[PDB]
């Protein structure tokens, strides 16, 4: 188990433009295209992202390329963030995967805001972190995925994914 396999399970793979759980136009492996209510705008972004006239449909290979770029950006976003970097540095490999997953899903800025949980994570207070993470919109909107990430963070093992 690794971050790639972990996110591929959490996000699935879709080759045609679709709406995410928030209702945003997405594609591939959780690749958000735009928050705008327009499919054309989505198609525009899609074509610009892929570099060809796609017509709202891509290949597996294209989905995987977007996915590689997105995981990479998530990591780099973490390392560049003053609030996140130190948390990350202090964690074991499994738990880093948990943090990366949250970032990929909610953006750096979003996670950077979980002030209290970041502190608990840093103090390695696992059970408390788990409780605190659960009191969030994130958990209430996507509970199964959230439970998976939380267990990973709490336990430091890949059990929730096995």
Give CA separation, 131 vs 7, 80, 128, in Å. Answer: 22, 27, 5
Binding mask 90-129 for Cl ion (x = CB under 5 A): ----------------------------------------
67 is in an annotated binding site: no
- The answer to the question of residue 144 lying near Cl ion (CB under 5 A) is yes
Applying CB under 5 A, which of residues 142, 147, 156, 161 lies at the interface with Cl ion? 142
Instruction: Show the tokens assigned to 113.
Output: 């805001």
5 is catalytic: no
Cβ-based neighbours of 83, under 8 Å, separated by 6 or more: 112, 115, 118
- The answer to the question of residue 49 lying near Cl ion (CB under 5 A) is yes
Burial classification of residue 83, based on how many CB atoms lie within 10 Å of its CB (0-12 exposed, 13-18 middle, 19 or more buried): middle
- The answer to the question of residue 53 lying near Cl ion (CB under 5 A) is no
How many angstroms separate the CA atoms of 154 and 105, rounded? Answer: 18
Are the beta carbons of 27 and 17 closer than 8 angstroms?
yes
Give CA separation, 77 vs 5, 12, 32, 38, 66, in Å. Answer: 20, 23, 16, 28, 16
**Catalytic one among 10, 11, 45, 62?**
11
CB nearer Cl ion, residue 2 or residue 141: 141
Closest distance of CB 49 from Cl ion, Å? 4
Closest distance of CB 141 from Cl ion, Å? 8
Applying CB under 5 A, which of residues 43, 95, 96, 145 lies at the interface with Cl ion? 145
The annotated binding site is made up of 32, 104, 117, 132
Residues forming the site for Cl ion (CB under 5 A)? 49, 142, 144-145
């Amino acid at each position: 188990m690794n971050i790639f396999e972990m996110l591929r399970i959490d996000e699935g793979l879709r080759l045609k433009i679709y709406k995410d759980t928030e209702g945003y136009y997405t594609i591939g492996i959780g690749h958000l295209l735009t928050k705008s209510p327009s499919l054309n705008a989505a198609k525009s972004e899609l074509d610009k992202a892929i570099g060809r006239n796609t017509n709202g449909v891509i290949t597996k290979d294209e989905a995987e390329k977007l996915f590689n770029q997105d995981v990479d950006a998530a990591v780099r976003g973490i390392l560049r963030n003053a609030k996140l970097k130190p948390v990350y540095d202090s964690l074991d490999a499994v738990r880093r995967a948990a943090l990366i997953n949250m970032v990929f899903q909610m953006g750096e800025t979003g996670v950077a805001g979980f002030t209290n949980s970041l502190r608990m994570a840093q103090q390695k207070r696992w059970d408390e972190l788990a409780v605190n993470l659960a009191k969030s919109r994130w958990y209430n909107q996507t509970p199964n995925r959230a439970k998976r990430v939380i267990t990973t963070f709490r336990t430091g093992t890949w059990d929730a994914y096995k």
